[PDB]
Amino acid sequence: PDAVFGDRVRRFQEFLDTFTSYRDSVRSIQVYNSNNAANYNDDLNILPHRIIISLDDLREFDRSFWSGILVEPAYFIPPAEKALTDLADSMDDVPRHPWKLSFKGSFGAHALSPRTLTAQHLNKLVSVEGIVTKTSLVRPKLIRSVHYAAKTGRFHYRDYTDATTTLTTRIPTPAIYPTEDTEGNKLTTEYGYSTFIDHQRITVQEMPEMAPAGQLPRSIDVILDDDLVDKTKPGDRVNVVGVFKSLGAGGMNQSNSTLIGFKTLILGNTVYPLHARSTGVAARQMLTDFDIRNINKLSKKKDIFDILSQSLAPSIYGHDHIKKAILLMLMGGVEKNLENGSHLRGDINILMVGDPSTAKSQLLRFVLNTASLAIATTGRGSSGVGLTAAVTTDRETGERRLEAGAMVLADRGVVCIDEFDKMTDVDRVAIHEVMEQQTVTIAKAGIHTTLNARCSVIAAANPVFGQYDVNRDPHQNIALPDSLLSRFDLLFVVTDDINEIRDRSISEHVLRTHRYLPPGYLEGEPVRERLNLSLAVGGNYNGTEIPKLVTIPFLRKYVQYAKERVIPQLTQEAINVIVKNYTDLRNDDNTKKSPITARTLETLIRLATAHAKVRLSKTVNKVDAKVAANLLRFALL
Amino acid sequence: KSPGDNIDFQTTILSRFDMIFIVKDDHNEERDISIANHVINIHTGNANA
Numbered sequence: 213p214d215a216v217f218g219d220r221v222r223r224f225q226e227f228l229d230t231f232t233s234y235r236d237s238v239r240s241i242q243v244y245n246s247n248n249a250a251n252y253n254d255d256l257n258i259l260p261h262r263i264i265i266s267l268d269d270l271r272e273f274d275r276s277f278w279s280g281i282l283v284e285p286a287y288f289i290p291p292a293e294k295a296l297t298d299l300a301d302s303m304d305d306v307p308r309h310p311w312k313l314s315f316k317g318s319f320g321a322h323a324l325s326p327r328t329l330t331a332q333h334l335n336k337l338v339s340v341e342g343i344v345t346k347t348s349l350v351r352p353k354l355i356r357s358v359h360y361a362a363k364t365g366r367f368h369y370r371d372y373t374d375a376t377t378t379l380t381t382r383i384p385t386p387a388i389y390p391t392e393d394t395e396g397n398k399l400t401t402e403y404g405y406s407t408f409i410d411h412q413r414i415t416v417q418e419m420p421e422m423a424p425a426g427q428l429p430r431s432i433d434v435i436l437d438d439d440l441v442d443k444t445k446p447g448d449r450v451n452v453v454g455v456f457k458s459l460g461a462g463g464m465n466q467s468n469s470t471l472i473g474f475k476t477l478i479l480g481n482t483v484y485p486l487h488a489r490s491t492g493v494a495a496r497q498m499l500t501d502f503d504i505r506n507i508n509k510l511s512k513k514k515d516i517f518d519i520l521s522q523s524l525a526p527s528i529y530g531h532d533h534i535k536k537a538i539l540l541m542l543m544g545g546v547e548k549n550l551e552n553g554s555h556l557r558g559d560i561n562i563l564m565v566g567d568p569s570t571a572k573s574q575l576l577r578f579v580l581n582t583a584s585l586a587i588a589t590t591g592r593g594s595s596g597v598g599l600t601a602a603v604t605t606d607r608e609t610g611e612r613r614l615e616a617g618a619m620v621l622a623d624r625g626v627v628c629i630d631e632f633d634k635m636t637d638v639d640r641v642a643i644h645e646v647m648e649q650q651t652v653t654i655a656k657a658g659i660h661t662t663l664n665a666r667c668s669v670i671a672a673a674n675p676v677f678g679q680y681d682v683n684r685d686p687h688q689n690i691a692l693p694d695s696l697l698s699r700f701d702l703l704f705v706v707t708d709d710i711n712e713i714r715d716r717s718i719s720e721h722v723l724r725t726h727r728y729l730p731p732g733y734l735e736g737e738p739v740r741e742r743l744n745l746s747l748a749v750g751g752n753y754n755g756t757e758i759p760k761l762v763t764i765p766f767l768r769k770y771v772q773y774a775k776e777r778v779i780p781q782l783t784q785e786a787i788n789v790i791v792k793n794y795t796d797l798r799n800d801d802n803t804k805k806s807p808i809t810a811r812t813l814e815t816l817i818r819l820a821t822a823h824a825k826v827r828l829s830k831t832v833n834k835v836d837a838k839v840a841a842n843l844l845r846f847a848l849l
Numbered sequence: 850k851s852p853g854d855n856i857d858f859q860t861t862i863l864s865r866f867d868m869i870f871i872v873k874d875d876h877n878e879e880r881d882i883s884i885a886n887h888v889i890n891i892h893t894g895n896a897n898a
C-alpha cells in the first residue's frame with residue numbers, strides 16, 4: 213500500500229461526494245444492469261462500467277488533482293479509478309469488473325494533433341482530433357486462463373498482464389501458459405471459463421481539412437480495450453482522449469541493439485466520433501424537454517409546413533416549392549420492408565435543372581450544411597468506383613477488402629450532387645440501381661456482395677444549351693434518359709426570367725443580405741471562420757426561438773425528432789386522393805417535363821408521408837395527400 | 850463574331866467570372882510607337898531609373 217495513492221483515493225472520494233452527477237450516473241448504470249439481469253432471470257444490453265468525468269468541474273474542485281491527471285496521469289488516474297470502484301461497490305452491496313474513467317472538457321495545451329504531438333507530451337493525457345485511417349480487427353486478448361486437472365479434478369487459473377493494460381510500469385513477469393500442474397498432471401484448457409478482452413488498434417491521421425495542403429500527413433496509433441472497440445470506422449473524424457505512452461526499450465538492450473526509437477501510442481480512454489461536413493458521422497443533438505415541448509408546439513399550427521420550408525434558406529429569395537421539396541426530402545418518407553423480402557423506397561430525390569446563377573449550388577451547399585449525414589459530390593470529380601465502392605488489398609490478412617464510396621457512406625442520409633449532367637455513362641448505370649433498389653451490388657474478382665446505399669439524392673444540372681428555352685420541348689432541353697427522370701421524384705426547372713419588379717426584389721433582398729454582422733462583431737472587423745465539429749451523441753436575421761422564422765439549429769432538432777419519433781401510416785382518405793390524382797396525371801393531355809410512370813405514384817405516397825412527419829401525425833390525412841399532389845403538379849406543370 | 854463565339858468553352862463560364870476584359874490590338878501608329886518606345890526604355894534601363 214502507498215500513502216500518496218490512498219490520499220489521492222480519498223481526494224477523489226471527496227470530489228465524487230461533491231458532485232452527485234457521477235454518483236447517480238453510477239446508480240443509473242447499475243440499475244440498468246440489474247433490471248436487464250432480472251428480466252433475463254424472469255423472461256438485452258449491458259452498459260459498460262465507466263463514467264464520463266468533466267475536467268472543468270475537477271479544475272473547480274481541486275487544481276492540484278486536475279493538473280495531476282493532465283500532466284502525470286499514471287499517478288493520478290488509477291487512484292481515481294479505485295475511488296470510483298469503491299463508490300460503486302458501496303451501493304452495490306444490496307443488489308466485479310473494475311470501473312474505468314473517461315474525460316471531457318477543455319484540455320488547454322493538451323488538445324493536440326497527430327502532427328503537433330511531440331515527445332514533450334509523452335506520459336501525459338492528450339486529446340487528439342483527427343481522422344481514422346486504419347482500424348485493425350477486433351481481437352480477443354487472454355487475461356485469465358482456466359484449466360482443469362482430470363486426475364485430481366480441480367480447476368486452476370493463471371492471470372496475464374502486459375504493459376498496455378496498466379498505466380504504471382511494473383516488473384515484466386512472463387508467466388507461461390500452464391499445460392501441467394505442480395504435481396505433473398496434464399491440464400485441459402477450459403474455454404468458456406477463460407476471460408478474453410477485446411483489443412483494437414486504430415490509426416488516427418490529421419484531418420485533411422486542417423492539414424498542410426502539400427505535405428505528407430502524420431499519424432498516431434491508439435489502443436482500445438473492451439468497451440471502446442468498434443466505436444469507429446475508417447473515414448470518421450474522431451477525438452481520442454488518452455495517455456501518450458512510450459513502451460519497451462528503444463534498442464537499448466543487447467538483443468534489440470535499430471532506430472525505431474521508443475514506440476509511441478495512445479492508451480485510449482475516450483473516443484468521440486465527431487460530425488464533420490461531408491463525412492460518415494451523422495450529427496446528433498441532445499433533445500431537452502423544453503425543446504420537445506417547443507417542437508410539439510410547432511406541430512399544432514396549421515401554417516407549420518410554410519414556416520419550416522421558408523426557414524430553410526432565408527438568404528435565397530423565392531424558390532419556395534424547392535424549399536418544400538427539400539424539407540420533405542429531409543423528412544424522408546417511410547421505407548417498407550415486405551414479408552417476402554421485397555423492398556419499397558421511402559427516400560425522396562430532387563433534381564434541379566435550369567439557368568446558371570439561380571441558387572442551385574447554394575441550395576446544395578445548404579443541404580450539405582443542414583442535413584445530418586449529407587455527402588457532397590461533383591460530376592466529373594468522382595467516378596463509378598468513387599460513388600459506389602472499390603476493392604483494395606489488406607496488408608495483414610492479405611485478402612481483398614472493400615472501400616465504401618459516396619453512396620455507401622451516405623447510407624440513411626443525403627448525397628448532394630453538383631453538375632449532375634457531367635457524369636460518365638458507367639457512373640449513371642451505377643446511379644440507376646442506387647436511386648431505386650437502394651443498394652449497390654458489386655461482383656469483382658472474387659468479391660460478390662451487396663451494400664446498403666439507402667440515400668436521398670439531390671442534384672443540380674445544367675441544360676445542354678446552357679440556358680432553358682421555353683419554346684423547345686424539355687426532352688432536348690434536359691437531355692437526360694427517361695429512366696433517370698423516373699428515378700427523381702421531383703424535377704424543378706428554374707428559369708432566370710427577367711422582370712423589373714422581380715429584379716428589384718432580387719436586388720433589395722441581396723443588398724439587405726450583404727449588410728449583416730454577427731453579434732459581438734464590430735463594423736469593420738472581418739468575420740473569422742471556425743471549422744465546424746459537432747459531437748454525435750447516441751430576409752429577417754432576428755430569428756430566435758420561433759418569433760416568425762425558425763432557426764437552423766432548431767430546424768435540425770425538429771427534423772431529428774420527426775425522423776426518430778413518428779412513422780406515419782396511410783389511411784383511405786389519403787389513398788383516395790392519391791389514386792385520383794395519379795389517375796388524372798397518367799391520362800392528362802398536358803405536356804409535362806418528366807414522364808409519368810408508376811414511380812410517380814409512390815412518389816406521391818412518400819411526399820404525403822413526408823408531410824405527415826412535418827405535422828408529427830401518426831396518420832396520413834387528406835391534407836397531406838393534397839399538399840403532396842399540388843407540390844408534384846407545380847414540378848410537373 | 851460574338852464574344853461567346855470566340856471563346857473555346859461554354860458561355861456559362863463567362864457569367865461565372867466577376868469582371869471580363871476583352872483586350873484589343875488597336876492597330877494604329879500613334880499607339881505602337883509609344884509601346885515600342887516603352888519597351889526600348891525597358892531594355893535600356895531608363896525605365897528602371
Ligand SMILES: Nc1ncnc2c1ncn2[C@@H]1O[C@H](COP(=O)(O)OP(=O)(O)O)[C@@H](O)[C@H]1O
Pocket residue numbers: 527528529530531567568569570571572573574575672722
Ligand atoms: N434566388 C436567389 N436568391 C438569392 N441569391 C441568389 C438567388 N439565385 C442566385 N443567387 C446568388 O447567385 C450566386 C450564384 O450561385 P448559384 O446560383 O448557386 O450558382 P448555380 O445556379 O450555377 O448553381 C450565389 O452566390 C447566390 O447568392
Ligand SMILES: [Mg+2]
Pocket residue numbers: 569572573
Ligand atoms: Mg452552380
